[PDB]
Design a protein around this ligand. Sequence first.
Ligand SMILES: [Cl-]
Ligand SMILES: [Cl-]
Lengths: 35, 35, 18, 21, 27, 27, 21, 18
Amino acid sequence: SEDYERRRSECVSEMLDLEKQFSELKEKLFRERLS
Amino acid sequence: SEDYERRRSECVSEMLDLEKQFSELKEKLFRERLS
Amino acid sequence: SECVSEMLDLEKQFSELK
Amino acid sequence: RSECVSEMLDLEKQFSELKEK
Amino acid sequence: SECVSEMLDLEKQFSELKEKLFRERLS
Amino acid sequence: SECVSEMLDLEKQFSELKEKLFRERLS
Amino acid sequence: RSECVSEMLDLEKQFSELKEK
Amino acid sequence: SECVSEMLDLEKQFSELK
Ligand SMILES: [Cl-]
Ligand SMILES: [Cl-]
């Protein structure tokens, strides 16, 4: 058997994590460029 | 006299605030669309 | 500030939208 | 009636001003 | 109206700048 | 290499989806 | 040598898979 | 998970980039 939704969620959570790192960098660059 | 940099910073801070509201909505929509 | 009062208006409208 | 437009326009210009140079 | 199309115009400018900054800091 | 051009490709897909979602939830 | 490319490709496909339907 | 191990690699490379 395969816990398809558990596995899906672990993958989603990693993508969310990487995308929040990208976003944090974009927000830093935005604030630095305007300040 | 005009505290040009103080005034500039208050304007910048508001723009940062509005843009963080927009970002929070985009992040909510992203997570909901992937989950 | 004009920049600040207008942004506050915009922040309010974005809140109401949501 | 129509700050939406007027305000957007002004804030658009202020944003260009802030990210210049 | 709570300014929707104009709010979109502005958010678009912010997002375009963020994408350009990211690409530049990295490229 | 720490994968830079490929990291940009992916971030671009994420940002494009976020812009589409925002526009849709609001339009 | 080159997971960068291979990994990007796989994760690109996984991202399309996740946002489908 | 393949998705997870690859993402962790990508997260590490993004950290190293910074
Ligand atoms: Cl399992
Ligand atoms: Cl003053």
